[PDB]
Amino acid sequence: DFPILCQTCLGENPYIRMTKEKYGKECKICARPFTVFRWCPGVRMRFKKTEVCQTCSKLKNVCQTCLLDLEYGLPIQVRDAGLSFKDDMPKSDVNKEYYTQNMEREISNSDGTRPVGMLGKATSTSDMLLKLARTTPYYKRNRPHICSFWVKGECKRGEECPYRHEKPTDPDDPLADQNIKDRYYGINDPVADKLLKRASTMPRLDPPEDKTITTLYVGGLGDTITETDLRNHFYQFGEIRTITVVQRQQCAFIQFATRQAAEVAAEKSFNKLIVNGRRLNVKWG
């Protein structure tokens, strides 16, 4: 009873009518019958319905319809590229059936609210994916499918047509093909790969222009801030060597015992840290 859901599926209305079938469909993964839920998300929306059984969601920690993580809204291949691939799960036939069975007993014996072993891992995060995690609901995802009479030029329902009248996606784009099983296991997922390419460009971690340099060239200081903000932020890292301050261009230089600590302060800092409700931007030299 009650599905497991994204906030993005469930709807942008707080009031929702949602129907239930006892054994509605096989799950497209572990292939068992399971309680299925439909509901209307919104005014122009599509009537989504749960695609996979609740168990294999608890297993990989995901929405039932979307298969996007609960916290990050990221396809599974991504958050695995983000932490731990070694979760695994047999893809192969009768194994899948077997492992699902056992893991279904293991889950039965848990407190109920926890994605099994992954959650022991799931706490430690934020490497990148937080910064590539999506922020707001994305409703373009629930729109009705593309009317396929109209996309041949004919559709004779006129304005009534609940489907959507517009140009489809060119089958050329590798982002088209998108199997379900595939998106689930984290194989060759085009979306996930795209997000990976997007991850790399994040100006961030390579640093190291020069050896031993712990000099921090800090842009976007501002004249509200004091140094004491700086120190009481940065004593976490280690033994400071010193701090140079310039308020004429509002840039603050810093120096630490080891370069390692400076890299760190970059990492922890870059395009993340803000104090005095004002962004504190960092660069090398």
Binding site: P90, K91, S92, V94, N95, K96, Y98, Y99
Partner: peptide, 29 residues
């Protein structure tokens, strides 16, 4: 057919006990 040569038939990842198995990996043939 692929329950053998593709994907490890049924998998029991060994249970983990008071020691570190993280590091260990093994060589090819």
């Amino acid at each position: 057919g692929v329950d053998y040569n593709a994907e490890i038939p049924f998998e029991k990842k060994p249970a983990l006990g008071f020691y570190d198995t993280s590091e260990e990996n093994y060589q090819a043939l």
